[PDB]
């Protein structure tokens, strides 16, 4: 990895871009105005430690660089004297200024997340070098913000059927490794989820938390042995009972995921489950239930075709809320076409259908980890100051054919007001401190990470509150 | 990277579920039929390169793995005996073969691109291993056949208002680097493009093909300089006419973008351009013009109302087709809000009000390389063939699908694409297997360079 190969192509011409004496260069992000009326900042640490911090410059780079724009341009427009000075006065380490809002905070659109601003005036075109980089965080924040929406659903629904919010942080399974671009979106997006849950099989997000974050406890995120199609159906039509009973007696300690849809669903519920080997399901544990994956169709109505035939082999009860609760060592896992529409779908389904929450556990892939974009939360990086000639200038954009919310103006703050409202405060406002203390602080300047956060304090800052 | 931590959680279990005596997992990708009839098969060398080849099973490896498990299952269900029996009989080489279709190759949908399967028996369960590692070529097999997609239309256009294909590689550039979720997505999402386009500003994409694939040319892809609104806004309302003149004669030798629309896309264009500054635009060289970047709104009609704002203030001469060029040294590039679709719409909506595509070029971001999925092109990977107890079962998922036994691609003798399954390809009636074994016990067996996939991803009518 070299920064010096990591901008969109032309910012490497910017340098000669600006009016002469450009000493300051301040730009900002957001997640701008015009249902995800709040979002959770996660993801800039990963970034800053991995990417930004220490040697980033070295005379390799800078010469590996020089080739490379050589051929790239068809012409020699890289700053190697800019680049140089940054080796030569600061050891490689990036003259920048990174402020920004504590990680896992809930905050609500339009709202400054973080700025960027050079800390020496020879490195004025270093701020919108690194924008390409730092606008990436559009992904953990926006995986964090959907992922923390869909567990709102869940718990009001969890609140609403049963009157607890149990096994609440394993009722989204992340199953999104497969369906995203590469190993490292996948392992920053389940970082991303497990802000909010406990339950992942994109190993690689456990890895990511333990080196950028950590956690008290040994993981962050926790998986149960499971069985799929190609496993249950190298056994034969006539051994699916052989391989249902040798799954569940080797996993019989901890909560197993068997597929009852690979030959006939009705058969493995009814008869193998709720007859032949039903001694060995009712034996299990609280801690250790048989999970039933139901069969493909539609994701409410299978989860009802389960619930319903396993009722008519199983006990089931009404809890406190009078909803239907399958027995302890029995539950449900949808794991095919789980989005936040479909989430709201199923769980709404449930409950008129006098169904508790505390039967059901999700898993998403793509809806979770892939199919989400900048556009969702309107993820923006803008330029709000200059100083050029030792004259400051609040730059923005306000165009008339759009006019979405448009570019806030200035050196910029973020504060709680008395009555507990977020405000970010435009053309230098919050250096009058009327509305409290600045929500954002120092994270990164000049190749040191200045503000750290454990994983934990990221999961407290994000948690559900009963408002 | 420790490929024992790249699989998903639940196929870390699965040397605990297959019935006693497996010997053989054999699992294959295809793109399922269902717009995109063809694709480009791109990607796997990479992946091959950076995640599967040599020494990828260590001791080290394996006690992290199993430390991880420990707690990630709250049991031991990891399988340290099987890893070890890798480490010790393979020096950490994967016991696997790879077969696969050449990289650039456009098949159709329903056919077999590629096959996974375990060389030693007592590895059946490593061809669910590395599926989640192997299904991930989806991405860069989408970006490629998507930006193909669109190389058709810029091509059909491109021909009919000009009568020729010069520049085709330079008319859709990548701008996607902000709009993707990681570094890595974003070098395989670039290089993706580059098969099929030259024009680029994700440089990330450039040190990928290097290392993973190779050039004759010195890099893969090309930029020109450009001006946006912040290092605009940046000069005052004033100096907007000192800011476009001190980048035009900083670039002068290079052609040069300038977002035009930072204070008034008319008087920028009618007095700045037009004729303040008229003299170092006339000037200019045609391998080194001017590119006016349109204003905000609609894509079409901006493009348009730039072209028609260019008309009534510079030399417009109807080509030889009949439509109308801009001066060599005047350009447009369209880069916001561009897709397959807008695409589409944009090149029709000018060849409606007689502009030759000549005369624009376009940027796209997170429509080319993000705004994708597995779903596109039905990405699939399923298990056709399990020997157990010595007899061969075909498998194929059935719910309310797959192909059946060992696969082979072939070409017909009236140019047809055909996948033959359950080992049919033995026989060899419609010639020789197109998938050639790419990958065997930790060694990458055949390697393609870029303009080998250029040459194989090319347009039938180039
Ligand atoms: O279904 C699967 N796993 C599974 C099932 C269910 C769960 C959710 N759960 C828990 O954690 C838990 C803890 C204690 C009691 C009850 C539960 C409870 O219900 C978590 C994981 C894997 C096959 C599917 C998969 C994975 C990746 C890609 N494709 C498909
Ligand atoms: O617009 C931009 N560059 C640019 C301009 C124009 C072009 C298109 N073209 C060429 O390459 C070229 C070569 C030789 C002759 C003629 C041309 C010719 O017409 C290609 C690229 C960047 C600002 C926008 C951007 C970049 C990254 C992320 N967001 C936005």
């Known amino acids: 990895f070299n920064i010096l190969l ?32 709040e979002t959770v900042f996660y993801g800039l640490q990963y970034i800053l430690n991995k990417y930004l911090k220490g040697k980033v410059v070295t005379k390799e780079k800078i010469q590996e660089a020089k080739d490379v724009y050589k051929e790239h341009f068809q012409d020699d427009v890289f700053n190697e004297k800019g680049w140089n000075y940054i080796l030569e006065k600061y050891d490689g380490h990036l003259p920048i200024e990174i402020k920004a809002v504590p990680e896992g905070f809930v905050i609500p659109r339009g709202n400054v997340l973080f700025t960027v601003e050079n800390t020496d005036p020879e490195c004025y075109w270093l701020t919108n070098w690194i924008e390409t980089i730092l606008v990436q ?20 629904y969890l609140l ?13 399974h992340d199953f999104g490794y497969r369906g995203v671009s590469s190993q490292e979106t996948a392992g920053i997006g389940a970082s991303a989820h497990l802000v909010n849950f406990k339950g992942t099989d994109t190993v690689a997000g456990l890895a990511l938390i333990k080196k950028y974050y950590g956690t ?4 962050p995120g926790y998986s149960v042995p499971a069985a799929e199609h190609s496993t249950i159906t190298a056994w034969g039509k006539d051994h699916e009972k052989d391989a ?48 039933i994956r139901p069969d493909s169709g539609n994701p409410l109505d299978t989860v009802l075709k389960v619930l319903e035939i396993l009722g008519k082999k199983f006990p089931v009860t009404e809890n406190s809320k009078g909803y239907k609760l ?31 929450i505390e039967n059901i556990a999700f898993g998403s892939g793509g809806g979770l980890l892939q199919k989400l974009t900048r556009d969702l939360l309107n993820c923006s990086f803008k330029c709000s100051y200059v100083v050029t000639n030792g004259l400051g200038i609040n730059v923005f954009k306000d165009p008339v054919a759009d006019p979405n919310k448009r570019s806030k103006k200035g050196r910029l703050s973020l504060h709680r007001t008395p009555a507990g409202n977020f405000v970010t405060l435009e053309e230098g406002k919050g250096d009058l401190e009327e509305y409290g203390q600045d929500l954002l602080h120092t994270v ?23 408002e």
């Open 6 to 37: 990591a901008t969109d192509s032309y910012k490497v011409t910017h340098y000669k871009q600006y009016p002469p004496n450009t000493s300051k260069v301040y730009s900002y992000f957001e997640c701008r105005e015009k249902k995800y009326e």
């Open 137 to 156: 965080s559009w992904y953990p924040i926006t995986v964090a913000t959907n992922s923390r929406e869909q567990k709102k659903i869940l718990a009001k």
């Open 160 to 172: 609403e059927t049963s009157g607890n919010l149990d096994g609440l942080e394993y009722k989204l």
């Open 216 to 219: 008290k406890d040994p993981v």
């Open 244 to 291: 249902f009973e040798h799954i569940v007696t080797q996993f019989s300690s901890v909560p197993v995921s068997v597929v009852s849809d690979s030959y006939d669903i009705y058969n493995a519920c009814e008869k193998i489950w709720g007859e032949d080997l039903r001694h060995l399901i009712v034996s299990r544990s609280t801690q250790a239930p048989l999970i």
């Open 326 to 356: 399958l027995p302890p060592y029995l539950r449900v896992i949808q794991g095919d076409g789980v989005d936040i529409n479909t989430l709201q779908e199923i769980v709404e389904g449930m409950k008129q259908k006098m169904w508790s």
């Open 444 to 466: 990164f300047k000049n190749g040191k990470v200045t503000k750290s956060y454990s994983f934990d304090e990221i999961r407290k800052n994000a948690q559900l509150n009963i």
